[PDB]
């Protein structure tokens, strides 16, 4: 939603456990294993669905 | 007097140690059938589990020792378990048998590593990213390690099994010496003896597995 | 000589001749060590 | 240096706020986040979130679950599915529901149903411990 | 004469062995601190375990002292 | 790996149970609006 | 004379060896506190593992009391 | 004259057993540092637990020291 | 003739006990490293605790040295 | 004579107390490894602490060596 | 002779200082395992540290062995 | 007549130093357990490190035993 007159069809990406676990930029996030990343990815799926619905 | 159970047994003047060392394989009957009795079924399940445990980490050349390493673990485990029965003579308490088990296998692995693999065999004495001013020292260490591996194998078996047996015998004496005295204390010592017996069963199996696993790792470092 | 090497040496030939050669060298080494131990005793 | 965004799906508590310490009940333990805290990302369990303002004052909330992300730029993002100020809950209902959940646990015989009962039990235990 | 002297030396050697109980109690209470900082809601049960730890480790140390005194006075 | 994940659950179900439990413990002055705001209405096909 | 003296000294030195058992018990129960604060639902399995570790440390102490008594009595 | 020599050597041995309390206090306060870095809002209770653990470890160390002083002066 | 010899042996045995403070200081500063790598904003208070821990662990060591210098010189 | 004999024995005993320095150095550098793996951005400062920790624990060991050379070569 | 006897005993005593380096190498390599499990992308840097830590801990141990020889052969 | 006695005592003292390798191997394999429970995807490399650590830590112990034999049998 942009304005009362304007809206734009947007697209957002959804990553898997293997994408965020295998990333080299995630090596700086401490106290992380596959279980916390699984929980985090599930919750973020719910969050992105909610945000899309509200837009 | 105290080490009487580790002296080469003799019956009527003959070396009964020969029979005691040849007996363990008699407890493993084999069959050509497809569906056979409970003993062979359980034993074949155990042998398959043991082979998959010991041998999956090896390449095609280290997997030619499947027969050797499975035979080693079966033989040692059955000898250690049969050594727990009353009055028995355990041949794995002898430094001679354990040296004759340890030196051939370790020497075979290191000679296999020096025949082929010779570049990597000589490179193994130095870890990959070792800093420069320390390269000499870490070669004096690793080298002597490779030279104590056989002895530290045999002793680790001998010194363990022997010790276990000794402990049990001593606790046994305790119970006997306490049989004519307070009986609740005798029962407490007997419960300690039962816990020690279960621990000795576990240690029999664990020592078989660890001897075989160290031989397996020496083989893996040379194939 | 018969039915022994048919049930003992034909099955164990691939291992005694090919696989355990280094084991045989090491067993010679072990015998040498045991001879040096028993002789200095 | 710490920019703290604390939000619920329907309500924003902090938005880029400059707090100095936040205590969160992560599923791998509780911890307190200050500026330059090591980057981490965790999911929450029911419990109190105590936000410490630069001027010593603290705000206590009760979050049911959600996520927490401490980033390399000292930016913290706390997102709770159900965040509630402590004055909106009552002790009696927490205790009654905890008792009901304990009873339904001692009754249930399934494994996943029992898992759900245990989740409800521990949630109500956190509620009881947090209220008083 | 020499027997009493060796009794003194042996009691000293035997009471060397309370170092293990000292280190073990240190470890038990350090881990209590750590595990309570992580899960401060288990404060009770955690402490129980700590108690149990301090009851077992110290026991070993006490054993040493017993032996020491048994060498010094009784036998 | 928590006990509920061993039992096959997910963090979405964990969150659902925990949020419902936090809602049930609300004093009735807030409870009706709380259960209206966060109630699900979508149905699966 | 000197033999009983050395027997006392050797008994003390041999009972020094259970300091390691005390320290190992401390380590086992501290790690039990930590692991239970981590996953408080595995209380039974964690306690059983702690009992096993304690038993094995006590066995390593028994191996020292064995030599203590082999010095003191059965020279 | 051998008793005084034995008392000296036995007191040195006895006071060896303080290394355990040294290492245990080190562990207690290192774990205090770690547990305070994780949860800096439990500082007072973490310090209470640290005081308790240090007190018990120092108690074992002082038991060793007092056995040493008992041998050295009061026989 | 034997008193001075026993004094040397007891002084060595007593100064053995500094190993405990060495290990405890190692633990304290390793924990400082870890707890600071976690939450560096506490770097002051963390370090404070370290000092305290240090000054206590080393304290035990000094006791040992004290007994050494009490055996070697004051007797 | 007996006094130089005891000097040798006491120097060896005093030298035993370098084990604590070895263990503490191991702990300091292991915790440096762990804390650098966790927060590699703090590396420099972490290394600083490691140095400090190292320089302190070794120092204790040095005292031990000192006492050794105080017995074997000085007094 | 009594001086050579004490040379033997003093070398045997001074050799105990290698326990510290053994335990320190154990700690350094356990912490290498943990730090590599945490951040496997620093396997080089970590390992460097590891060897450094080893090189230092064993260093202290070597001193003890060296000292032992310098009581057995030098004087 | 007396030098063989000192050889026995020095060999026992020198072999005391294997406690460090016992503890170091304990630390290495405990940290292998922990680091593999954290990242079971590196099970091979982790295990490799363990072996290395073990083979180095145990090395020091053999050093001690070496000296023990070099006091008991050679000179
Ligand atoms: C009666 C005691 C059995 C002694 C002879 C064992 C035998 O020949 O059975 C063949 C027996 C059956 O083998 P299978 O064909 O694999 O079931 O062969 C063996 O067990 C190998 C020889 C073991 C020697 C045991 C010495 C005691």
Determine the distance from the C-alpha atom of residue D59 to the mean position of all C-alpha atoms in its chain, rounded to a whole number.
13
Cα B4 to ligand 1 centre (Å): 29
Domain total for chain B? 1
Which positions ≥6 away from D102 have C-beta within 8 Å? D121
Other beta carbons within 10 Å of D39: 22
The C-alpha atoms of residue K23 and residue A36 are separated, in whole angstroms, by 34
SS (H, E, C) J30-71: HHHHHHHHHCHHHHHHHHHHHHHHHHHHHHHHHHHHHHHHHH
Fill in the DSSP letter of residue D89. Answer: B
The C-alpha atoms of residue G36 and residue G49 are separated, in whole angstroms, by 12
Q: Which residues of I1-35 are buried (b: 16+ CB within 10 A; e: fewer)?
A: eeeebbbbbbbbbbbbbbbbbbbbbbbbbbbbbbb
Residue K64, helix vs strand vs coil: helix
Asked if I37 has any chain J CB less than 8 Å from its own CB, the reply is: yes
Q: Which atom of ligand 1 is nearest to the CA of B29?
A: 17
Which positions ≥6 away from B125 have C-beta within 8 Å? B138, B139, B142, B143, B146
Terminal alpha carbon distance of chain I: 14
G42 burial class (0-12, 13-18, 19+ CB within 10 angstroms)? middle
The whole domain housing B169 covers: 1-223
Atom 6 of ligand 1, nearest CA residue: B26
Q: How many CB pairs under 8 A join A and F?
A: 16
Note the helical H segments in D12-111.
91-107
The CATH number assigned to the domain holding G62 equals 1.20.20.10
Atom 17 of ligand 1, nearest CA residue: B29
State residue D20 phi and psi, 5-degree precision.
-110, -20
B212 burial class (0-12, 13-18, 19+ CB within 10 angstroms)? buried
Domain boundaries, chain D: 1-89, 90-132
The C-alpha atoms of residue L71 and residue L12 are separated, in whole angstroms, by 10
**Neighbors of chain A with 3 or more C-beta pairs under 8 Å:** D, F, J, K
Other beta carbons within 10 Å of K44: 10
State residue D64 phi and psi, 5-degree precision.
-85, -40
The C-alpha atoms of residue I50 and residue J22 are separated, in whole angstroms, by 20
State residue K39 phi and psi, 5-degree precision.
-125, 75
Which positions ≥6 away from I23 have C-beta within 8 Å? H19, H22, H23, H26, J20, J23, J24, J27, J57, K20
Note the helical H segments in B178-220.
183-220
Residue I37 host element (H or E): helix I18-38
Residue B111 host element (H or E): helix B95-115
* Cβ-contact I18, H18 below 8 angstroms: no
The C-alpha atoms of residue G45 and residue I59 are separated, in whole angstroms, by 40
Bridge-based pairing of strands D40-43 and D67-70 is antiparallel
The C-alpha atoms of residue B171 and residue B169 are separated, in whole angstroms, by 5
Ligand 1 in contact with B18 (CB < 6 A)? no
Atom 19 of ligand 1, nearest CA residue: B26
The C-alpha atoms of residue D33 and residue D78 are separated, in whole angstroms, by 11
Which of chain G's residues have a Cβ under 8 Å away from the Cβ of E29? 30
Atom 12 of ligand 1, nearest CA residue: B29
Which positions ≥6 away from D28 have C-beta within 8 Å? A31, A36, D42, E38, G38
Judging contact as 3 or more Cβ pairs under 8 Å, the answer for D and H is yes
CB contact (8 A) between residue E17 and residue G13? no
The C-alpha atoms of residue B16 and residue B31 are separated, in whole angstroms, by 29
Residue in chain L lying closest to B125 (CA): L52
Q: How many CB pairs under 8 A join A and K?
A: 5
CB contact (8 A) between residue F12 and residue A43? yes
* Cβ-contact H39, D30 below 8 angstroms: yes
Which of B26, B71, B74 is the pocket-test mutation for ligand 1 (most atoms within 8 Å of CB)?
A: B26
* Cβ-contact H67, I68 below 8 angstroms: no
* Cβ-contact B168, B200 below 8 angstroms: yes
Structure token digits, residue D4:
């703290």
Long-range contacts, stretch A23-30, CB < 8 angstroms, 24+ apart: A24/K41, A27/K39, A27/K41, A27/K42, A28/D39, A28/D72, A28/J40, A28/J41, A29/D39, A29/D40, A29/D41, A30/D38, A30/D39, A30/D40, A30/I38, A30/J38, A30/J39, A30/K38
Residue F44, helix vs strand vs coil: coil
CB contact (8 A) between residue A36 and residue D28? yes
The C-alpha atoms of residue I21 and residue J61 are separated, in whole angstroms, by 9
The whole domain housing E40 covers: 2-73
How would you classify residue D77: left for phi > 0, otherwise alpha for psi between -120 and 50, otherwise beta? beta
Q: How many helices (H) and strands (E) does chain B have?
A: 7, 2
List of E strands, chain B: 10-11, 14-15
Which positions ≥6 away from J68 have C-beta within 8 Å? I12, J10, J11, J12, J14, J15, K14, K67
Structure token digits, residue B111:
């000679």
Bridge-based pairing of strands D58-63 and D40-43 is unpaired
Residue B37, helix vs strand vs coil: coil
CB contact (8 A) between residue L51 and residue B217? yes
Note the helical H segments in B30-65.
38-55
Which of chain B's residues have a Cβ under 8 Å away from the Cβ of L62? 144-145, 148, 152
Other beta carbons within 10 Å of D38: 21
Structure token digits, residue H43:
């500082």
Calculate the alpha carbon distances from J2 to B103, J5, J8, K4, K71 in Å: 46, 5, 10, 11, 16
Long-range contacts, stretch H52-55, CB < 8 angstroms, 24+ apart: H52/E29, H53/E25, H53/E26, H53/E28, H53/E29, H53/E30, H53/E32, H53/E33, H53/H24, H53/H28, H54/E29, H54/H25, H54/H28, H54/H29, H54/I56
Nearest to L36 by CA among L24, L27, L26, L45: L45
The C-alpha atoms of residue D84 and residue F26 are separated, in whole angstroms, by 9
* Cβ-contact A34, A19 below 8 angstroms: no
Method: cryo-EM
Ligand 1 in contact with B26 (CB < 6 A)? yes
The C-alpha atoms of residue A14 and residue E27 are separated, in whole angstroms, by 45
Give me the residue from J9, J22, J40 closest to K60, CB to CB: J22
The C-alpha atoms of residue B181 and residue L34 are separated, in whole angstroms, by 48
CB contact (8 A) between residue H18 and residue I20? yes
Terminal alpha carbon distance of chain J: 15
Asked if C27 has any chain B CB less than 8 Å from its own CB, the reply is: yes
Distance from CA of D129 to the nearest CA of E (A): 8
Nearest to I2 by CA among L5, J14, J1: J1
Rounded (5°) CA angle I66-I69-I75: 120
Find where tokens 């404060």 sit.
E43
State residue D18 phi and psi, 5-degree precision.
-100, 90
Q: Which residues of F7-40 are buried (b: 16+ CB within 10 A; e: fewer)?
A: bebebebbbbbbbbbbbbbbeeeebeebeeebee
Which positions ≥6 away from L12 have C-beta within 8 Å? K12, L68
Structure token digits, residue B217:
């790792």
Judging contact as 3 or more Cβ pairs under 8 Å, the answer for I and H is yes
Residue D60, helix vs strand vs coil: strand
Asked if L20 has any chain J CB less than 8 Å from its own CB, the reply is: yes
Tell me the Cα Rg of chain L.
Answer: 17
Ligand 1 in contact with B32 (CB < 6 A)? no
State residue D8 phi and psi, 5-degree precision.
-115, 160
Give me the residue from L2, L50, L60 closest to K22, CB to CB: L60
Strand partners for D63: D47, D83
Rounded (5°) CA angle D30-D33-D36: 145
Asked if I21 has any chain J CB less than 8 Å from its own CB, the reply is: yes
L3 burial class (0-12, 13-18, 19+ CB within 10 angstroms)? middle
* Cβ-contact D7, D78 below 8 angstroms: yes
How would you classify residue D56: left for phi > 0, otherwise alpha for psi between -120 and 50, otherwise beta? left
The C-alpha atoms of residue H50 and residue H48 are separated, in whole angstroms, by 5
Rounded (5°) CA angle B73-B75-B78: 100
The C-alpha atoms of residue E36 and residue E45 are separated, in whole angstroms, by 10
Ligand 1 in contact with B19 (CB < 6 A)? yes
The C-alpha atoms of residue J3 and residue D107 are separated, in whole angstroms, by 80
Cα B31 to ligand 1 centre (Å): 13
Structure token digits, residue L61:
């112990």
Q: List all residues of chain A from 14 to 33 with a beta carbon under 8 Å from chain J.
A: 28, 30
* Cβ-contact A17, A42 below 8 angstroms: no
Length of chain F: 45
Other beta carbons within 10 Å of I71: 27
The C-alpha atoms of residue D110 and residue D120 are separated, in whole angstroms, by 15
The C-alpha atoms of residue B121 and residue B110 are separated, in whole angstroms, by 8
Note the helical H segments in chain G.
2-15, 19-38, 43-72
Nearest to K30 by CA among L32, L56, J36, I29: L32
Rounded (5°) CA angle D53-I48-J17: 150
Atom 2 of ligand 1, nearest CA residue: B26
Calculate the alpha carbon distances from J68 to E10, I6, I62, K70 in Å: 24, 15, 16, 12
The C-alpha atoms of residue D33 and residue I39 are separated, in whole angstroms, by 7
The C-alpha atoms of residue F25 and residue D124 are separated, in whole angstroms, by 8
Strand partners for D84: D62
Give the CA count within 13 Å in the CB-facing half-sphere of F28: 1
Other beta carbons within 10 Å of I36: 24
**Neighbors of chain E with 3 or more C-beta pairs under 8 Å:** D, G, H
Cα B26 to ligand 1 centre (Å): 5
Cα B93 to ligand 1 centre (Å): 25
Structure token digits, residue I34:
């870890």
Distance from CA of K24 to the nearest CA of J (A): 4
Residue E52 host element (H or E): helix E43-69
Asked if J60 has any chain K CB less than 8 Å from its own CB, the reply is: no
3-state DSSP helix/strand/coil percent for chain I, to nearest 5? 90, 0, 10
Q: Which atom of ligand 1 is nearest to the CA of B31?
A: 17
The C-alpha atoms of residue B208 and residue B197 are separated, in whole angstroms, by 17
Atom 11 of ligand 1, nearest CA residue: B26
Domain total for chain I? 1
Strand partners for D30: D25
The C-alpha atoms of residue H3 and residue H9 are separated, in whole angstroms, by 10
Domain boundaries, chain F: 1-45
SS (H, E, C) chain A: CCCCCCCCCCCCCCCCHHHHHCCHHHHHCECCCHHHHHHHHHHHHHHHHHHHHHC
Which positions ≥6 away from B61 have C-beta within 8 Å? B223
Dihedral angle sign, alpha carbons of residues D99, D105, D108, D112? positive
Strand partners for D21: D52
The C-alpha atoms of residue J58 and residue B148 are separated, in whole angstroms, by 31
Which positions ≥6 away from D22 have C-beta within 8 Å? D2, D4, D6, D32, D33, D49, D50, D51, D52, D76, D78
* Cβ-contact B44, B33 below 8 angstroms: no
Strand partners for D41: D69
Q: Which residues of E9-39 are buried (b: 16+ CB within 10 A; e: fewer)?
A: bbbbbbbbbbbbbbbbbbbbbbbbbbbbbbb
Nearest to L61 by CA among F10, B152, D69: B152
Q: List all residues of chain F from 2 to 41 with a beta carbon under 8 Å from chain A.
A: 2, 5, 10-12, 14-15
Residue D77, helix vs strand vs coil: strand
Determine the distance from the C-alpha atom of residue I28 to the mean position of all C-alpha atoms in its chain, rounded to a whole number.
11
Bridge-based pairing of strands D3-8 and D75-79 is parallel
Distance from CA of J25 to the nearest CA of A (A): 25
Which residues of I touch chain D, with CB atoms under 8 Å apart? 37-42
Distance from CA of G41 to the nearest CA of D (A): 10
Q: Which atom of ligand 1 is nearest to the CA of B26?
A: 20
Terminal alpha carbon distance of chain E: 15
State residue D72 phi and psi, 5-degree precision.
-70, -20
Residue L38 host element (H or E): helix L19-38
């Amino acid at each position: 939603f942009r304005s009362v007159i304007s809206y734009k069809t947007e697209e957002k990406p959804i990553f898997s456990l293997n994408t965020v676990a295998s990333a080299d930029s995630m090596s700086i996030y401490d106290d992380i294993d596959a279980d916390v990343l699984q929980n985090y990815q599930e919750y973020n799926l719910a969050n992105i669905i909610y945000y899309s619905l509200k837009e | 007097n105290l080490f009487a159970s580790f002296i080469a047994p003799t019956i009527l003047g003959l070396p009964a140690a020969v029979l005691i060392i040849l007996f363990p394989p008699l407890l493993i009957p084999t069959s050509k059938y497809l569906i056979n009795n409970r003993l062979i079924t359980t034993q074949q399940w155990l042998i398959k589990l043991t082979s998959k445990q010991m041998m999956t980490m090896h390449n095609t050349k280290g997997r030619t020792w499947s027969l050797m390493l499975v035979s080693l673990i079966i033989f040692i485990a059955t000898t250690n378990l049969l050594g727990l029965l009353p009055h028995s003579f355990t041949p794995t308490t002898q430094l001679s048998m354990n040296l004759a088990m340890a030196i051939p296998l370790w020497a075979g692995t290191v000679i296999m590593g020096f025949r082929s693999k010779i570049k990597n065999a000589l490179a193994h004495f130095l870890p990959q990213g070792t800093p420069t001013p320390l390269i000499p020292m870490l070669v004096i260490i690793e080298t002597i390690s490779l030279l104590i591996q056989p002895m530290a194998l045999a002793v680790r078996l001998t010194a363990n099994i022997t010790a276990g047996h000794l402990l049990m015998h001593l606790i046994g004496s305790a119970t006997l010496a306490m049989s004519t005295i307070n009986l609740p204390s005798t029962l407490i010592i007997f419960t300690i003896l039962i816990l020690l017996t279960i621990l000795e069963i576990a240690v029999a199996l664990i020592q078989a597995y660890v001897f075989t696993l160290l031989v397996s790792l020496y083989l893996h470092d040379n194939t | 000589l018969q039915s022994i090497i048919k049930n003992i040496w034909i099955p164990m030939k691939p291992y005694y001749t090919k696989v355990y050669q280094e084991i045989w060298i090491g067993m010679g080494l072990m015998g040498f060590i045991v001879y040096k131990i028993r002789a200095a005793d | 240096q710490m920019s703290f965004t604390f939000a619920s799906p329907t309500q924003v508590f902090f938005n880029g706020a400059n707090v100095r310490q936040v205590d969160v009940p992560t599923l791998t333990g509780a911890f307190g986040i200050l500026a330059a805290h090591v980057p981490t990302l965790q999911v929450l369990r029911p419990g109190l979130v105590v936000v410490h303002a630069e001027d010593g004052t603290t705000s206590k909330y009760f979050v049911s679950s959600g996520s927490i992300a401490v980033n390399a730029d000292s930016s913290v993002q706390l997102l709770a599915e159900e965040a509630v100020t402590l004055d909106m809950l009552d002790l009696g209902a927490a205790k009654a529901n905890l008792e009901k959940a304990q009873a339904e646990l001692v009754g249930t015989a399934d494994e996943a149903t029992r898992a759900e009962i245990q989740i409800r039990i521990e949630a109500n235990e956190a509620l009881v411990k947090a209220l008083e | 004469d020499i027997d009493t002297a060796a009794k003194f030396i042996g009691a000293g050697a035997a009471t060397v062995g309370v170092a293990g109980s000292g280190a073990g109690i240190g470890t038990v209470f350090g881990s209590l601190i750590i595990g309570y900082a992580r899960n401060p809601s288990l404060k009770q049960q955690l402490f129980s375990y700590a108690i149990l730890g301090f009851a077992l480790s110290e026991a070993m140390g006490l054993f040493c002292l017993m032996v020491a005194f048994l060498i010094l006075f009784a036998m | 790996v928590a006990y509920w994940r061993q039992a096959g659950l997910s963090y979405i179900r964990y969150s659902q149970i925990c949020a419902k439990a936090v809602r049930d413990a609300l004093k009735t002055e807030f409870k009706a609006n709380a259960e209206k705001t966060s109630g699900s209405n979508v149905k699966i096909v």
